[PDB]
Design an enzyme around this catalytic site. Structure first.
Site, PDB file in Angstrom:
ATOM      1  N   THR C   1      -2.370  19.214  37.588  1.00 21.47           N
ATOM      2  CA  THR C   1      -3.088  19.534  38.874  1.00 21.47           C
ATOM      3  C   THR C   1      -3.131  18.067  39.377  1.00 21.47           C
ATOM      4  OG1 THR C   1      -3.944  21.535  38.320  1.00 21.47           O
ATOM      5  CG2 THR C   1      -5.239  20.077  40.231  1.00 21.47           C
TER       6      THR C   1
HETATM    7  B1  LIG Z   1      -4.242  21.959  37.054  1.00 23.46           B
HETATM    8  O1  LIG Z   1      -3.269  21.693  36.073  1.00 23.46           O
HETATM    9  O2  LIG Z   1      -5.066  21.266  36.247  1.00 23.46           O
HETATM   10  C1  LIG Z   1      -4.673  23.371  37.088  1.00 23.46           C
HETATM   11  C2  LIG Z   1      -5.658  23.832  38.011  1.00 23.46           C
HETATM   12  C3  LIG Z   1      -5.923  25.365  38.040  1.00 23.46           C
HETATM   13  C4  LIG Z   1      -7.172  25.633  39.057  1.00 23.46           C
HETATM   14  C5  LIG Z   1      -4.891  26.259  38.662  1.00 23.46           C
HETATM   15  N1  LIG Z   1      -4.853  23.998  35.696  1.00 23.46           N
HETATM   16  C6  LIG Z   1      -4.106  24.881  34.989  1.00 23.46           C
HETATM   17  O3  LIG Z   1      -3.117  25.010  35.532  1.00 23.46           O
HETATM   18  C7  LIG Z   1      -4.560  25.465  33.601  1.00 23.46           C
HETATM   19  C8  LIG Z   1      -4.018  24.451  32.554  1.00 23.46           C
HETATM   20  C9  LIG Z   1      -4.502  23.174  32.618  1.00 23.46           C
HETATM   21  C10 LIG Z   1      -3.489  22.198  32.870  1.00 23.46           C
HETATM   22  C11 LIG Z   1      -4.041  20.862  33.109  1.00 23.46           C
HETATM   23  C12 LIG Z   1      -5.302  20.551  32.888  1.00 23.46           C
HETATM   24  C13 LIG Z   1      -6.080  21.649  32.719  1.00 23.46           C
HETATM   25  C14 LIG Z   1      -5.734  22.720  32.535  1.00 23.46           C
HETATM   26  N2  LIG Z   1      -3.852  26.879  33.690  1.00 23.46           N
HETATM   27  C15 LIG Z   1      -4.471  27.840  33.553  1.00 23.46           C
HETATM   28  O4  LIG Z   1      -5.857  27.694  33.481  1.00 23.46           O
HETATM   29  C16 LIG Z   1      -3.916  29.047  33.359  1.00 23.46           C
HETATM   30  C17 LIG Z   1      -2.592  29.012  33.032  1.00 23.46           C
HETATM   31  N3  LIG Z   1      -1.916  30.394  32.917  1.00 23.46           N
HETATM   32  C18 LIG Z   1      -2.865  31.484  33.243  1.00 23.46           C
HETATM   33  C19 LIG Z   1      -4.069  31.398  33.538  1.00 23.46           C
HETATM   34  N4  LIG Z   1      -4.597  30.185  33.457  1.00 23.46           N
END
Ligand SMILES: *[B]([O])([O])[C]([C][C]([C])[C])[N]C(=O)[C]([C]C1=[C][C]=[C][C]=[C]1)[N]C(=O)C1=[C]N=[C][C]=N1
Ligand SMILES: *[B]([O])([O])[C]([C][C]([C])[C])[N]C(=O)[C]([C]C1=[C][C]=[C][C]=[C]1)[N]C(=O)C1=[C]N=[C][C]=N1
Ligand SMILES: [Cl-]
Ligand SMILES: [Mg+2]
Ligand SMILES: [Mg+2]
Ligand SMILES: [Mg+2]
Ligand SMILES: [Mg+2]
Lengths: 204, 231, 196, 243, 241, 250, 244, 226
Positions: C1
């Site tokens: 993110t």
């Molecule tokens: B981002 O990469 O931090 C993102 C923010 C969120 C609000 C969409 N997080 C995710 O995509 C997370 C994993 C992650 C990546 C990097 C740091 C922390 C966490 N993914 C998920 O929460 C997720 C993935 N697949 C299904 C449901 N949830």
């Protein structure tokens, strides 16, 4: 350690033409030690039959539980519970222990008294329903039973043919499993008569 | 009349009769006097006996090294409230390393008494208290009534015939406030004040109870031959 | 993110990438990480999708109930409610949230709330895995009291780089502009921002 | 009959007689007032000197809530303290969650809902106080008065207790003669006068004046007690006006 | 006669405490009226500030429950505010749990169910209030739903509440008998407010200044109250025709 | 701020009467007439929509309520008490039955659960009885069509036909003459409309009468296709137009 | 507070009686008569319905005779809604015993449990007692055929024949006159119906007014059968005994 | 499992395969993974089978009661909100991964929901072990303004990709179409591209082949009269 394979055992159920069959082995053990050769795994509440494999204390507990619940059902409803309704009751009861489950593999079998329709169903330990047309398998030799049923079975068998098919499915599957066998029972169920047969099988 | 069955009921003129009846228990109780100067604060209490074979009921209770009270009315209720004060004094020490202010001690008693006057089932406390103490702002004297009303005073008295001692202190106000650095003269003024509330009986050795707290004086109770000096 | 919020002369702008990942699989490539808690108080979400949604839903509830009783809440008040949830449930949450809002009195404000549940009021904030790659760039290029067009370019160039280097970031660059004029949504596609 | 014996019972009128009896306790108490000024509020109260033995300036009646709200009340003094204790818990939990200090209208409803709750059940007694309170928030100055029923409104001036009619008359003159507004220092002087004029209803025992104030200019929007020279200046002004 | 002190049945099958709570409703001596336009729902209420010392801006019996829902109360203010705070909490909780704005009629039902509980449970007294809920619902359109101390509630084409409710009710009845429609056929809410004020003047037989009235208007996606100057603009337009 | 009413408010008097139940029944007597008639191929329940004001929209107030797809209810007595009972009846049909057996309860058992709730208000601490009598009509596979009355006491009785409330004594006599065991549903609706006309003073039309049936399965009202076993609700509320059609052949 | 409105349901009178129990018994004395008669080869339960209406659906109706398990039934006199609360508790107790011991509950144990529940309402909780009297008809392998009664006090006793509800004084005199120890089920059926026929406040005893049941160890191959009589079957037994 | 949801002009379509597995064994060959929450709100499920059934039935039950309470047809956002809050509370331990779709008075909707309680909005979605195979098809053939016929085709093609290429998925394609202003049409076994061929031999035994020790009649009837 794995609760589903301490005591051992198997149940199989099949549908035929205007009939169902449910069968089970008689073994109860403590892993390698065989203890009892009279431990039946099929029970009935009115005309609905329930086979249960898995941890033997839970087999006994659930039999006592479903006797309890179907007795109260009958007093309030003023009629015997049907297989379709009982299936839902089994599922409900298992799922309410979702995070501390009964270590069992139940199998419902019976004929709906109103519609006359043959019915079988199987469940995992937390109550997911598999409502099969053909057959249901459960226990330590479930892989073996799946193989036998999937090759031996054909639809619309007459009661006395269905007896031969289910018996050969059970016996040959049990003989390829260390924790199953030691005798076997086969119920042949028709709309208003039920025949119970003890099978001669190898006692090792 | 119809509005005195419990503490939760106002009368048509806005009165709480159960509180006023609890107030009456104090007037039946034995007389006790409180007074202070800038340096010291003194409690003087007339203890009461059941008969000649009995002991004289203790009137003064220590709450901390720097604070204590005298009671008039139901003694068990004074025990409950003094135990609460002991705990609050103790909490202030353990948590904040701070001696509890006498004004704040009064506020805590007020609020404890109040809860019993507004809720059903409970009853008001049946006792009046005179709290003396020496804290960071010098000597203090409080009067607690079980209505909840707490009052900081130079001097006062509560109990039976207490109006006599209270009038004396009201005249003597200018004299006894100036008794600084002289505990024995302040006690004398308290003993002379409580004498105005006596009839028939007089101050004997096991009748009188005196307590004092001050600048370099912990809260200490004097009974028996320790008070023969002041008779 | 990759997420950021930047205060400028007329208000505040929030920007974010649009990628959600399960390991290296992109579960959602058009995610909306800019979410409304009140008419002119929004947040940028990073960390667990479930946690940040659960928190944001609760915050939206609290501020709706605040508004019914006490009128429009401040951006500081919104940040405090986020903090209270993130701090008190720190053991069970993985949420990195930037809170941004527009008052007429206070103008544009940005509060960042990292993993611990601490609050930090800042002129701009960056967060998420992809923010690491743009600390240098953002520090050198940020000025106070930028115009709307300058701030949009600052966010666009910044998140473009964050996307370029971070595998966990990608897709479209979404933005939300918060001024006295109202609430404007902007979107920028790969063909636009990659060639920058 | 019997409708007045239990709290929360509607009489055939539609009245809660127990709440009306609580009002009698309030009417019995000493006079307290509130004056809204240009950028703040002023509170004052009559303290009856029962005896010479009362220590002057020590038995403080006006109470602070948070750092920006003043509370004064007439009637059962312990009931007032209980209400302020609750007010402090409400103000603390508001500031804990929302960061900003509690707005005065928000604070007014917190007390209002709590007092009203004590008219809903027979297991509790209504409050035997009318409470005048207020202060300065982000939207400016606010003065309120809260009755035993839970009823409250905003006020330009407020008065309660035994001298309320006398005080109300004097407050009404100030509203008519100062439509553009009254200054904070003026309001302190006028508050002293009004308590002195209202003392004719409690004229047997002599009394002690106590004043407090919140003002944006004079106190930085914080609650403070009027002390020393400013208190004596207000007493002198009051003493001059009665003579 | 303790069957008259708590909410249990009298021999006649009556709840006297509920009946006496209805009488508390008129204690304020204020009359309210609600009507529906095409796009809007208007609610007006008398505003009486007897004391000169009162801050007139804080004297109100109209409440903004949510963005879409407004509520006018006939009854004492402490019970009115009790009801208001609960309705606000209920509306917010509904949005959080079910993901959409609480409809006016559903809130009315919820508050009526709560009022029913006080008529059945002895320890809780009824609130001495009548709650008139108004909105422009996204499904049902302009909506007026009213709750009382019995726990009764129903939808309305228009309604009135207070001491002189019957005079206002019959005035409105007679208008809708002529027009033969369930609403005020008018495009702008401004003219629907003018209708509401005009028909209250006719029914009550009293003239109104800007400070004698209090107005609430529900449109699609917001409910708002009018200021004294917004009402004055309304009063000028009535007088000029 | 305590519920101190942990004692019964309904008690036995010296004569053996439970006063609050009798008084609740008196409240039911004052309430508007409602009735139920059972046919061979259906059940009908009906009542007057007594409008409190002509400005009030009587369509919004539903006196006849769906409990399950095959069970309906109507009342006489206190409307708010009925409304909360309907809410609890719908919920108990799910919690104590559908979530266990995967099917809706039969009429008699849902009635039994409602009865239980009403009994508890007659014995539990700090509550009065419900001031309603319910008529519950329903269908299930093994019992067929049925009609039950439920009183403030919690007592319930199955009926071929009955009436409750204002003009129930007269209405029950009218039904005794007209009812037979060979009635079709349309004949029962006709008899229901005739019986209800006697107890109504003012206007008598589809806008002032509320009437529902438990009849044939309505696959058009189901809202989806593709499951042969789910054939649709047997409960149907008749429209204002559908009532007026039958009033012309009256 | 609330004390003002408390009836105090669980106190003694100056004479040492429980007010509410006595008044509950007065309630029960107006309820329709129920008779239990125990024979050597079975038990009869007969009971009179209270609400004669031609429009009452009798074949699906149950106000008097309820089934507790396969071996035990009850006849009710009093508030039916109160009785159903207790009946469902008793049904559960029987199944709890069956689950625990893998044996059907002995009749006395079930009766004692219900009677203990009723007792509790007279000694604590401040609630009104259950306005119900039961006749328990049951069988077990220890004592064989058993009749019991319980009342709102929670006292229970065993009987050879017994009545509850209305006209019990008259009914118990008639049973005491014609009952004998060597009696059989068919004779007991006749006695039960004859006793109701004389004690009834109605003009005549008919099939639509009765609920009737038998517990016989006259099932196929030495088992016990509970027969709840259908309306037509009650009409047949009324003609057979010569009452209609 | 392979489950998909595809938005179209006047509604939404969902599809699923019919295989459930434990380890490498196929437990059920004709599984029903399309669950009705309310008449016009359906969802496709993946993950732990008991959990998906339990969670849809619970929310479906509460949605029905909510619909009766409010006198309104249920909304997809309500089912979504109730599902996510329930799943979040159980911190991923209830293993339900769902694609929730439907029509209501607000319009047509398509959401996904994961076991930990996160939700997503889209025009096309896939879940389960075969979601990568399905999403490949969807990413190659999806466009804006699909017709009903085009969306059913795309959805079933996406399931087929899962059936053929993912070992966790197989057998048949189930479809449900939810169009605005119409009854939802549940198409059970819409495609059947995996019928077993005739066996070479019949394994029906001669009667008397199995050795028996004892026979007896089982009494299933109740205790008899007389
Ligand atoms: B981002 O990469 O931090 C993102 C923010 C969120 C609000 C969409 N997080 C995710 O995509 C997370 C994993 C992650 C990546 C990097 C740091 C922390 C966490 N993914 C998920 O929460 C997720 C993935 N697949 C299904 C449901 N949830
Ligand atoms: B799919 O593959 O996600 C499918 C969806 C389900 C709704 C039918 N899942 C399963 O078939 C799961 C896979 C699984 C295995 C082991 C742990 C968790 C999940 N199977 C079952 O739930 C299952 C298997 N055998 C019997 C009963 N249930
Ligand atoms: Cl509710
Ligand atoms: Mg073997
Ligand atoms: Mg071996
Ligand atoms: Mg990238
Ligand atoms: Mg009550």
């Amino acid at each position: 350690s794995d609760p589903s394979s301490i005591n051992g055992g198997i149940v199989v159920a099949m549908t035929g033409k205007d009939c169902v069959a449910i069968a089970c082995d008689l073994r109860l053990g403590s892993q390698s030690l065989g203890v009892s050769n009279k431990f039946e795994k099929i029970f009935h509440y009115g005309h609905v039959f329930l086979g249960i494999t898995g941890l033997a204390t839970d087999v006994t507990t659930l039999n006592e539980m479903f006797r309890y619940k179907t007795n109260l059902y009958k007093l309030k409803e003023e009629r015997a519970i049907e297989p379709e309704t009982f299936t839902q009751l089994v599922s409900s009861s298992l799922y309410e222990r979702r995070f501390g489950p009964y270590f069992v593999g139940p199998v419902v079998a019976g004929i709906n008294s109103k519609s006359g329709k043959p019915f079988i169903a199987g469940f995992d330990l937390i109550g997911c329903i598999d409502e099969a047309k053909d057959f249901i398998v459960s226990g330590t030799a479930s892989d073996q039973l799946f193989g036998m049923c999937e090759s031996l079975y054909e639809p619309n068998l007459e009661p006395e043919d269905l007896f031969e098919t289910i018996s050969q499915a059970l016996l040959n599957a049990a003989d390829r499993d260390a924790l199953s066998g030691w005798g076997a029972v086969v119920y042949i169920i028709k709309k208003d008569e039920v025949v119970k047969r003890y099978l001669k099988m190898r006692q090792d | 009349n119809n509005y005195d069955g419990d503490t939760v009921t106002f009368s048509p003129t806005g009165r709480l009769f159960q509180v006023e009846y609890a107030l009456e228990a104090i007037k039946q109780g034995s007389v006790t006097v409180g007074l202070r100067s800038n340096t010291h604060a003194v409690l003087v209490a007339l203890k009461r006996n059941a008969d000649e074979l009995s002991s004289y009921q203790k009137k003064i209770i220590k709450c901390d090294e720097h604070m204590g009270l005298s009671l008039a009315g139901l003694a068990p209720d004074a025990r409950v409230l003094s135990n609460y004060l002991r705990q609050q004094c103790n909490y202030s020490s353990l948590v904040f390393n701070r001696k509890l202010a006498v004004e704040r001690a009064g506020h805590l008693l007020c609020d404890k008494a109040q809860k019993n006057t507004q809720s059903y089932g409970g009853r008001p406390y049946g006792v009046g208290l005179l709290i003396i103490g020496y804290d960071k702002s010098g000597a203090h004297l409080l009067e607690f009534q079980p209505s909840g009303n707490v009052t900081e005073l130079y001097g006062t008295a509560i109990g039976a015939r207490s109006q006599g001692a209270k009038t004396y202190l009201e005249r003597t106000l200018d004299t006894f406030i100036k008794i600084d650095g002289n505990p024995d003269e302040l006690i004398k003024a308290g003993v002379e004040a409580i004498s105005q509330s006596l009839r028939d009986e007089s101050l004997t050795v096991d009748n009188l109870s005196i307590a004092i707290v001050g600048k370099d004086t912990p809260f200490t109770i004097y009974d028996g031959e320790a008070v023969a000096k002041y008779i | 993110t990759s997420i950021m919020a930047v205060t400028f002369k007329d208000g505040v702008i929030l920007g974010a990438d649009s990628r959600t990942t399960t390991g290296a699989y992109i579960a959602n490539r058009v995610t909306d990480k800019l979410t409304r808690v009140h008419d002119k108080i929004w947040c940028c979400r990073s960390g667990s999708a479930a946690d940040t949604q659960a928190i944001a839903d609760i915050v939206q509830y609290h501020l709706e109930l605040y508004t019914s009783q006490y009128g429009t809440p401040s951006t500081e008040t919104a940040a405090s409610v986020f903090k209270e949830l993130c701090y008190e449930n720190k053991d069970n949450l993985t949420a990195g949230i930037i809170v941004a809002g527009y008052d007429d009195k206070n103008k544009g404000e940005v509060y960042t709330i990292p993993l611990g549940g601490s609050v930090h009021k800042l002129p701009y904030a960056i967060a998420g895995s992809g923010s690491t790659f743009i600390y240098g760039y953002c520090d050198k290029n940020f000025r106070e009291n930028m115009s709307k067009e300058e701030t949009v370019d600052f966010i666009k160039h910044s998140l473009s780089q964050a996307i370029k280097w971070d595998g966990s970031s990608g897709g479209v660059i979404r933005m939300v502009v918060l001024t006295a004029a109202g609430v404007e949504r902007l979107i920028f596609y790969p063909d636009e921002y990659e060639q920058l | 009959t019997g409708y007045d014996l239990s709290n929360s019972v509607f009489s055939p009128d539609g009245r809660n007689f127990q709440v009306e009896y609580a009002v009698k306790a309030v009417e019995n108490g000493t006079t307290s007032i509130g004056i809204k000024c240009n950028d703040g509020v002023v509170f004052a109260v009559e303290k009856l000197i029962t005896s010479k033995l009362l220590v002057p300036q020590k038995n403080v009646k006006i109470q602070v809530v948070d750092r920006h709200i003043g509370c004064v009340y007439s009637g059962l003094i312990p009931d007032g303290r209980h209400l302020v204790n609750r007010g402090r818990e409400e103000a603390a939990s508001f500031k804990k969650l929302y960061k900003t200090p509690i707005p005065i209208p928000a604070f007014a409803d917190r007390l209002g809902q709590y007092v009203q709750a004590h008219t809903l059940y027979n297991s509790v007694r209504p409050f035997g106080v009318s409470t005048i309170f207020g202060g300065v928030d982000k939207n400016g100055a606010h003065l309120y008065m809260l009755e035993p029923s839970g009823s409250y409104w905003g006020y330009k001036g407020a008065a309660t207790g035994k001298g309320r009619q006398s005080a109300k008359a004097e407050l009404e003159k100030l509203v008519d003669h100062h439509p553009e507004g009254l200054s904070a220092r003026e309001a302190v002087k006028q508050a002293a006068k009004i308590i002195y004029l209202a003392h004719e209803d409690n004229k047997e025992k002599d009394f002690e004046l106590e004043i407090s104030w919140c003002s944006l200019s004079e106190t930085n929007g914080l609650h403070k007690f009027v002390k020393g020279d400013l208190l004596q200046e207000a007493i002198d002004f009051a003493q001059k006006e009665i003579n | 006669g303790y069957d008259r002190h708590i909410t249990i049945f009298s021999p006649e099958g009556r709840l006297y405490q509920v009946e006496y709570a209805f009488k508390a409703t008129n204690q304020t001596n204020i009359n309210s009226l609600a009507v529906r336009g095409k796009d809007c729902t208007v609610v007006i209420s008398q505003k009486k500030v007897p004391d000169k010392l009162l801050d007139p801006t804080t004297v109100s019996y109209i409440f903004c429950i949510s963005r879409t829902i407004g509520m006018v109360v006939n009854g004492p203010i402490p019970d009115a505010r009790n009801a208001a705070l609960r309705a606000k909490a209920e509306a917010a909780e509904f949005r959080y749990k079910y993901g959409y704005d609480m409809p006016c009629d559903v809130l009315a039902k919820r508050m009526a169910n709560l009022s029913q509980i006080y008529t059945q449970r002895a320890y809780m007294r009824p609130l001495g209030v009548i709650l008139t809920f108004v909105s422009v619902d996204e499904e049902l359109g302009p909506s007026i739903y009213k709750t009382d101390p019995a726990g009764y509630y129903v939808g309305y084409k228009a309604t009135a509440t207070g001491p002189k409710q019957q005079e206002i009710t019959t005035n409105l009845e007679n208008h809708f008998k002529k027009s033969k429609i369930d609403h005020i056929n008018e495009e702008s809410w401004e003219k629907v407010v003018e209708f509401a004020i005009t028909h209250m003047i006719d029914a009550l037989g009293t003239e109104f200044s800007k400070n004698d009235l209090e107005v609430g208007v529900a449109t699609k996606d917001k409910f708002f109250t009018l200021s004294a100057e917004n009402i004055e603009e309304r009063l000028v337009a009535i007088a000029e025709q | 701020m305590t519920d101190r009413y942990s004692f019964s408010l309904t008690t036995f008097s010296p004569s053996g009467k439970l006063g609050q139940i009798d008084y609740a029944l008196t409240a039911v007597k004052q309430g508007v007439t409602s009735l139920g008639i059972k046919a061979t191929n259906g059940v009908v329940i009906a009542t007057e929509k007594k409008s409190s004001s002509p400005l009030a929209m009587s369509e919004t107030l539903s006196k006849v309520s769906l409990l399950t797809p095959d069970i309906g209810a109507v009342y006489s007595g206190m409307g708010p008490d009925y409304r909360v009972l309907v809410d609890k009846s719908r919920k108990v049909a799910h919690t104590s039955y559908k979530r266990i057996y995967g099917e809706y309860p039969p009429t008699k058992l849902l009635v039994s659960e409602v009865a239980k709730i009403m009994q508890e208000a007659t014995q539990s601490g700090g509550v009065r009885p419900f001031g309603v009598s319910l008529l519950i009509a329903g269908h299930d596979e093994f019992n067929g069509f049925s009609l039950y009355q439920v009183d403030p006491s919690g007592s319930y009785f199955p009926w071929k036909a009955t009436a409750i409330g204002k003009g129930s004594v007269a209405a029950k006599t009218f039904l005794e003459k007209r009812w037979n065991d060979e009635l079709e549903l349309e004949d029962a609706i006709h008899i229901a409309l005739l019986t209800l006309k006697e107890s109504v003073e003012g206007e008598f039309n589809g806008d002032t009468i509320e009437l529902a049936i438990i009849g044939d399965e309505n696959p058009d009202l189901l809202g989806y296709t593709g499951i042969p076993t789910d054939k649709g609700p047997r409960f149907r509320k008749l429209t204002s137009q559908e009532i007026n059609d039958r009033l012309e052949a009256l | 507070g609330s004390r003002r409105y408390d009836s105090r349901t669980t106190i003694f009178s100056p004479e040492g009686r429980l007010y509410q129990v006595e008044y509950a018994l007065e309630s029960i004395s107006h309820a329709g008569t129920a008779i239990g008669i125990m024979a050597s080869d079975g038990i009869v339960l007969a009971a009179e319905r209270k609400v004669t209406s031609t429009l009452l659906e009798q074949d699906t109706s149950t106000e008097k005779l309820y089934k507790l398990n396969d071996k035990i039934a009850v006849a009710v006199a009093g508030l039916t809604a109160d009785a159903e609360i207790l009946i469902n508790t008793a049904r559960i107790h029987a199944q709890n015993y069956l689950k625990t011991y893998n044996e059907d509950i002995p009749v006395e144990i079930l009766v004692r449990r219900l009677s203990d529940i009723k007792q509790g309402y007279t000694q604590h909780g401040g609630l009104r007692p259950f306005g119900v009297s039961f006749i328990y008809a049951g069988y077990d392998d220890r004592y064989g055929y058993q009749l019991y009664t319980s009342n709102p006090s929670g006292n229970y006793t065993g009987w050879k024949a017994i009545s509850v509800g209305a006209n019990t004084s008259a009914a118990q005199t008639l049973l005491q006159m014609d009952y004998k120890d060597d009696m059989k089920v068919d004779d007991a059926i006749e006695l039960a119906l004859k006793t109701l026929s004389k004690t009834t406040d109605s003009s005549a005893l008919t099939y639509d007014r009765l609920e009737f049941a038998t517990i016989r160890k006259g099932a196929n191959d030495g088992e016990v059968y509970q027969k709840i009589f259908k309306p037509q079957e009650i009409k047949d037994i009324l003609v057979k005994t010569g009452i209609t | 499992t392979t489950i998909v949801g595809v938005k179209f002009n006047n509604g939404v379509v969902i599809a699923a395969d019919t295989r459930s597995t434990q380890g490498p064994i196929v437990a059920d060959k004709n599984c029903a993974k399309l669950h009705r929450i309310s008449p016009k709100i359906w969802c496709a499920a993946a993950g732990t089978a008991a959990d998906t059934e339990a969670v849809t039935q619970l929310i479906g039950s509460n949605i029905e009661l909510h619909s009766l309470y409010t006198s309104r047809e249920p909304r997809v956002v309500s089912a979504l909100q109730m599902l996510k809050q329930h799943l979040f509370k159980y911190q991923g331990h209830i293993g339900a991964y769902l694609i929730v779709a439907g029509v209501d008075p607000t319009g047509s909707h398509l959401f996904s929901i994961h076991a930990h309680g996160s939700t997503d909005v889209g025009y096309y979605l896939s879940l389960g072990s075969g979601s990568l195979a399905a999403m490949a098809v969807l990413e190659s053939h999806w466009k804006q303004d699909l017709t009903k016929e085009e969306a059913i085709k795309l959805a079933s093609d996406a399931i087929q990709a899962g059936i053929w290429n993912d070992l966790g998925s197989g057998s048949n394609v189930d479809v449900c179409v939810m169009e605005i202003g119409k009854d939802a049409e549940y198409l059970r076994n819409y495609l059947t591209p995996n019928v077993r061929e005739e066996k070479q031999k019949s394994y029906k035994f001669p009667r008397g082949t199995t050795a028996v020790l004892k026979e007896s009649i089982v009494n299933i009837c109740d205790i008899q009269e007389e």
